[PDB]
Design a protein around this nucleic acid. Structure first.
Length: 112
DNA sequence: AATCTATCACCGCAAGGGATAAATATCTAACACCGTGCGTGTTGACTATTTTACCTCTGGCGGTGATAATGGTTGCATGTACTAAGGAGGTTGT
């Protein structure tokens, strides 16, 4: 399932730690795995959590990657595929696999 | 294993029925003739048997279209009766 978390995080340019339960991957339960896999969620999406800023927004601009070329932008196939429903159809798995591409049409595939 | 008297009857032996085969008379069929016409023969002119050549069919198959069209389908495996196995995880114990 996964796409909800990673897409809304990239739209926001930022993702707070606890929003892993606000936009949950409807798949898995790995709560103690988080404390290292958060690494490649942050070198291309960095954020953390505290009571309140006042003038402090800029942090992303000195601390982040720049092309989303092939990495967690596409190897995330495994982490969206990983829960195909044990007895239920190829007419389901393709819906998880297209968890990659949404609708790059009308100019994005022209840029390809 | 021979003897017979005394059964129920086959012989004892008169009658008469059908049969078949002779002679006759009828039938048909086998043939020998005749006449028809067809498949007896060569020859000849036809036209389209086959071949090859040429000019120009049919169907071999390779090739791929653009005003634009950019989140899909798919219905019923089964409702029962069993129960053996693996899977879970907290814990009260080993």
């Amino acid at each position: 399932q996964l796409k909800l978390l990673v897409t809304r995080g990239k739209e926001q340019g930022y993702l707070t730690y606890a929003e892993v339960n606000d936009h949950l991957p409807e798949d898995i339960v790995d709560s103690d795995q988080i404390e290292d896999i958060i690494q490649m969620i942050n070198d291309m999406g960095i954020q953390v959590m505290e009571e309140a800023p006042d003038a402090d927004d800029l942090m992303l601009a000195e601390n982040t990657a720049d092309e989303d070329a092939a990495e967690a932008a596409a190897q995330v196939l495994s982490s969206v595929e990983s829960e195909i429903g044990r007895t239920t159809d190829p007419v389901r798995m393709y819906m998880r696999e297209m968890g990659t591409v949404e609708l790059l049409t009308r100019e994005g595939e022209i840029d390809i």
